[PDB]
Amino acid sequence: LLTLDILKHGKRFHATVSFDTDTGLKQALETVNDYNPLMKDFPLNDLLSATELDKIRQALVAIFTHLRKIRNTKYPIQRALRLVEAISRDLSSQLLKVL
Amino acid sequence: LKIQVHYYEDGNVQLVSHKDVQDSVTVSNEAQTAKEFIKIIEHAENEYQTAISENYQTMSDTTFKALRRQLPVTRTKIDWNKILSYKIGKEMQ
Amino acid sequence: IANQPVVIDNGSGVIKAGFAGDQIPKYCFPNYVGRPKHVRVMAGALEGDIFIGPKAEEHRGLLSIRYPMEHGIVKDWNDMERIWQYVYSKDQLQTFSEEHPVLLTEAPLNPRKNRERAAEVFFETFNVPALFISMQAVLSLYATGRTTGVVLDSGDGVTHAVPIYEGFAMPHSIMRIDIAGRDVSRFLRLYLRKEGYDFHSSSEFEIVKAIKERACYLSINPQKDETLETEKAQYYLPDGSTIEIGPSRFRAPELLFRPDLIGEESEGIHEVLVFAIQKSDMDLRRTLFSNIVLSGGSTLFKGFGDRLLSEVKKLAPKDVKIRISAPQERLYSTWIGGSILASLDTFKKMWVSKKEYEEDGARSIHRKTF
Numbered sequence: 001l002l003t004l005d006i007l008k009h010g011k012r013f014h015a016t017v018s019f020d021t022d023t024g025l026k027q028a029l030e031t032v033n034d035y036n037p038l039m040k041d042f043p044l045n046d047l048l049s050a051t052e053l054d055k056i057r058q059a060l061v062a063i064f065t066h067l068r069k070i071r072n073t074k075y076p077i078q079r080a081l082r083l084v085e086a087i088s089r090d091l092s093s094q095l096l097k098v099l
Numbered sequence: 100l101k102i103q104v105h106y107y108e109d110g111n112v113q114l115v116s117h118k119d120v121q122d123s124v125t126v127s128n129e130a131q132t133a134k135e136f137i138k139i140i141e142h143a144e145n146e147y148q149t150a151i152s153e154n155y156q157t158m159s160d161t162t163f164k165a166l167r168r169q170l171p172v173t174r175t176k177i178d179w180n181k182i183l184s185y186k187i188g189k190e191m192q
Numbered sequence: 193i194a195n196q197p198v199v200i201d202n203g204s205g206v207i208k209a210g211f212a213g214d215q216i217p218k219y220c221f222p223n224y225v226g227r228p229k230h231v232r233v234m235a236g237a238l239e240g241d242i243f244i245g246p247k248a249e250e251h252r253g254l255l256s257i258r259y260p261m262e263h264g265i266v267k268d269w270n271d272m273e274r275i276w277q278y279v280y281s282k283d284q285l286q287t288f289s290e291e292h293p294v295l296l297t298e299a300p301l302n303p304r305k306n307r308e309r310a311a312e313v314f315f316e317t318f319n320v321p322a323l324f325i326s327m328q329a330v331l332s333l334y335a336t337g338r339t340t341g342v343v344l345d346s347g348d349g350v351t352h353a354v355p356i357y358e359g360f361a362m363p364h365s366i367m368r369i370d371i372a373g374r375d376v377s378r379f380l381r382l383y384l385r386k387e388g389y390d391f392h393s394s395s396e397f398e399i400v401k402a403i404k405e406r407a408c409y410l411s412i413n414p415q416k417d418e419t420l421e422t423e424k425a426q427y428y429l430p431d432g433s434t435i436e437i438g439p440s441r442f443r444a445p446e447l448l449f450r451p452d453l454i455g456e457e458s459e460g461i462h463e464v465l466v467f468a469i470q471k472s473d474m475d476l477r478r479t480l481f482s483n484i485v486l487s488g489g490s491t492l493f494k495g496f497g498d499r500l501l502s503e504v505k506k507l508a509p510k511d512v513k514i515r516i517s518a519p520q521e522r523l524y525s526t527w528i529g530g531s532i533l534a535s536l537d538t539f540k541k542m543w544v545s546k547k548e549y550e551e552d553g554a555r556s557i558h559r560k561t562f
């Protein structure tokens with residue numbers, strides 16, 4: 001901020017305004033904050049140590065009900081579809097060792 | 100002297116006008132005021148038709164310029180690339 | 193991206209430069225190139241051949257001063273490269289031409305080749321990140337703060353009037369004659385010869401410029417004063433001599449209002465203003481007459497603005513308020529306007545990037561010339 005004050009006090013507005021506008025940190029942080037509660041406390045561990053299919057039943061329903069908060073956070077289409085296939089990837093891995 | 104003119108070839112245009120002529124003369128005689136009535140008539144009618152024609156003459160630059168100019172005040176076209184590309188400096192005064 | 197835009201105001205006589213955002217141009221010097229005339233004999237002499245700036249001004253006797261730009265058109269590009277390179281030297285900027293976008297002032301109606309080759313010079317030898325060529329009148333009005341009005345400038349090699357409407361400089365009303373400061377000095381040199389005093393050396397033409405800058409004025413009545421014998425004030429040369437001028441001091445800048453003295457069918461300054469205003473939309477004439485801005489060093493003569501008012505009143509229609517402004521930074525008008533323009537966030541979108549220049553070429557510059 002002291003360097004920014006140097007450039008502001010020296011009437012050079014370029015680097016000062018670009019320090020917040022040219023840097024995409026502001027929009028990156030706001031999208032991060034939009035996805036911030038969605039990424040904290042994710043029940044993937046419910047899927048990790050689940051060897052019994054009943055644990056997997058309740059686990060699958062639990063993870064998707066926690067994922068239900070993407071209605072308010074603008075989730076993308078293709079991102080959600082690759083997400084679903086990733087969920088099925090770990091489902092398949094768990095079932096492979098289960099068999 | 101009310102006038103109504105319609106024209107609609109590939110469009111629609113209507114001219115509606117009238118002049119509230121006001122003139123006087125003493126009724127001197129009959130033939131004198133007959134042809135004198137014609138004198139006032141020929142005066143007002145030649146005047147009115149001519150004036151109407153010149154109103155049509157001075158319309159590209161006055162009446163239409165009250166509505167829509169033919170060219171902007173800068174007498175050039177619009178550099179759409181300029182306006183869209185950047186703000187002309189309108190933010191600065 | 194770069195550090196900061198450098199506003200380099202050219203000029204056929206005095207180049208002016210500095211960074212954008214600056215208040216006044218910190219670096220100003222004459223636009224000439226002086227190389228020695230005599231013979232290097234003694235060792236330990238002034239090393240180096242071409243001199244520009246204060247050193248060329250100091251040892252003025254040795255040099256054979258020439259100008260690379262005349263009438264806003266570059267005649268020699270090598271001397272211009274050395275001048276621009278001098279601007280980026282340790283004596284003026286101490287920077288590199290690789291981290292600074294460049295705002296470049298340029299006079300109207302000039303050939304395309306000026307912008308083209310000047311752009312090649314910058315983007316190739318200097319490799320600047322972004323170049324932006326602009327007018328000069330637009331910058332002067334931006335420097336005064338107002339927005340619609342004509343701009344009457346007379347620098348060292350050009351003079352023109354531009355009716356600017358909110359920034360859109362009307363390109364169909366820019367009258368431009370080539371009678372400016374340097375030519376007035378040239379005609380003054382001719383009159384000094386007719387007085388008896390001869391000055392013909394290239395490094396003496398500068399003394400003629402000094403005389404023009406501190407001993408000439410403009411007569412209100414152009415003829416009534418010619419029919420009288422003035423006080424004939426003296427003048428001290430750098431040599432220490434004495435020159436009595438006489439009538440050769442008011443008739444010398446009279447050239448600007450009548451280029452018949454030089455023998456040319458051009459017009460005066462007043463006619464350039466009146467024709468620039470009258471070749472515009474009739475709905476803006478009163479607004480333009482109420483806003484006239486002067487700039488350029490040739491508008492510094494004594495009695496200049498007053499005579500301009502008299503002349504314009506003789507040419508403008510009756511009972512129309514004529515108003516000529518004359519700020520105190522007529523020498524720095526285009527540079528201060530460049531400092532205001534380039535210091536804005538829209539300048540990022542207003543320049544030409546180096547990548548773009550490498551893609552399209554000179555056509556990209558003519559495309560985005562405004």
Ligand SMILES: Nc1ncnc2c1ncn2[C@@H]1O[C@H](COP(=O)(O)OP(=O)(O)O)[C@@H](O)[C@H]1O
Nearest residue numbers: 202203204205206347348373405489490492493
């Ligand atoms: N006090 C003065 N009176 C008259 N002319 C002057 C005076 N000072 C400078 N000049 C002339 O004005 C010119 C400066 O204009 P300049 O800044 O060169 O315009 P540009 O930079 O656009 O060419 C100089 O060439 C000089 O001859």
